[PDB]
Design an enzyme around this catalytic site. Structure first.
Site, PDB file in Angstrom:
ATOM      1  CG  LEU A  10     -29.781  -2.877   0.858  1.00  0.00           C
ATOM      2  CD1 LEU A  10     -28.983  -4.207   1.258  1.00  0.00           C
ATOM      3  CD2 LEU A  10     -30.294  -2.145   1.987  1.00  0.00           C
ATOM      4  N   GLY A  11     -27.654  -0.629  -2.720  1.00  0.00           N
ATOM      5  CA  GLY A  11     -28.019  -0.063  -3.707  1.00  0.00           C
ATOM      6  C   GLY A  11     -27.079   1.081  -3.976  1.00  0.00           C
ATOM      7  N   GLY A  13     -26.064   3.869  -5.863  1.00  0.00           N
ATOM      8  CA  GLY A  13     -26.546   4.634  -7.187  1.00  0.00           C
ATOM      9  C   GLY A  13     -25.541   5.740  -7.424  1.00  0.00           C
ATOM     10  CE1 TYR A  15     -29.823   7.301  -5.191  1.00  0.00           C
ATOM     11  CE2 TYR A  15     -30.644   8.942  -6.578  1.00  0.00           C
ATOM     12  CZ  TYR A  15     -30.700   7.812  -6.066  1.00  0.00           C
ATOM     13  OH  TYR A  15     -31.709   6.803  -6.367  1.00  0.00           O
ATOM     14  CD  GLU A  17     -22.416   4.208   0.471  1.00  0.00           C
ATOM     15  OE1 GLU A  17     -23.086   4.099   1.638  1.00  0.00           O
ATOM     16  OE2 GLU A  17     -21.067   4.055   0.447  1.00  0.00           O
ATOM     17  CG  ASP A 122     -37.306   6.640 -12.402  1.00  0.00           C
ATOM     18  OD1 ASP A 122     -36.084   6.696 -11.876  1.00  0.00           O
ATOM     19  OD2 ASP A 122     -37.518   6.538 -13.614  1.00  0.00           O
TER      20      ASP A 122
END
Ligand SMILES: NC(=O)CSc1nc2ncnc(N)c2[nH]1
EC number: 2.7.11.1
Length: 265
Positions: A10-11, A13, A15, A17, A122
């Site tokens: 899904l994402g 990043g 760090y 996922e 953020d």
């Protein structure tokens, strides 16, 4: 692979996922964020801790956490709509009524966080997710922090966030109030929605587009796409002195903020 199957990514990043997990019995979907503490343990214990404080219709739900080795699994509301980022047509933005409704829902979420003494730090369209009926939810509390506890405010000192979204005081001052920074980032997101571009790489005296805005050259090219009533609100959000910058209670009384634009479901 944890009571639930990990169906799709899904994402991805830094760090780790975020995966879409489905329960094979009940068919229920959730997002699982997977962080390998080997590949920080400090901010992740803050993230889950902040996440357990959270309960609001415009914040991504937290369901729970397991540790399974090094591997932390934050279980999180799935938002099938994806990122607000993908509803912004580059150079164009989106229909004004859509932007306004997302902006109402963003402020609702931000009022709620600030009310419980949390700042997200953020806010940007990548971090604003859409559920099934296109309701906006604030996502990812990994940079979030407490700025008010036992009713006492503390100034922030750490610089964080994402440069095009960051307020100028955070580049200029050693300590600064948390809420005006979130407000500023909310105005960059509103600009992104109404013009489909970001106005500057960063809010620096050394940055020409930023200099142009302070000189009120609104004949140039984010601002010229916008429209006088949302633009007037942006003149009050994107004010360089954080003490003259408009606050949320005053955003809620702005004329465009209260202007009727959009039909029901
Ligand atoms: N990479 C990150 O920190 C979050 S990515 C992400 N997180 C999500 N939560 C719910 N639904 C989605 N589509 C999601 N995508």
């Amino acid at each position: 692979v944890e009571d639930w199957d990990l169906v799709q990514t899904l994402g991805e990043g830094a760090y780790g996922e975020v995966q879409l997990a489905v329960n094979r019995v009940t068919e229920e979907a959730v997002a699982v964020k997977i962080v390998d503490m080997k590949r920080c343990p400090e901010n992740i214990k803050k993230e889950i801790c902040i996440n357990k404080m959270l309960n609001h219709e415009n914040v991504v739900k937290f369901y729970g956490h397991r540790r399974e080795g090094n591997i932390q699994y934050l279980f999180l509301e799935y938002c099938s709509g994806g990122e607000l980022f993908d509803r912004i047509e580059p150079d164009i933005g989106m229909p004004e009524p859509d932007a306004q409704r997302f902006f109402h829902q963003l402020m609702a979420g931000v009022v709620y966080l600030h009310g419980i003494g949390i700042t997200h730090r953020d806010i940007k369209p990548e971090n604003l997710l859409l559920d099934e009926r296109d309701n906006l939810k604030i996502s990812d509390f990994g940079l979030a922090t407490v700025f008010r506890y036992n009713n006492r405010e503390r100034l922030l000192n750490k610089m964080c966030g994402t440069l095009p979204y960051v307020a100028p005081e955070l580049l200029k001052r050693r300590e600064f109030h948390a809420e005006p920074v979130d407000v500023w980032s909310c105005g960059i997101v509103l600009t992104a929605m109404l013009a489909g571009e970001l106005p500057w790489d960063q809010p620096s005296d050394s940055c020409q587009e930023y200099s142009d805005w302070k000189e009120k050259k609104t004949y140039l090219n984010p601002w010229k796409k916008i429209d006088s009533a949302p633009l007037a609100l942006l003149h009050k959000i994107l004010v360089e002195n954080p003490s003259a910058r408009i606050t949320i209670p005053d955003i809620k009384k702005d004329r465009w903020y209260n202007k009727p634009l959009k039909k029901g479901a």
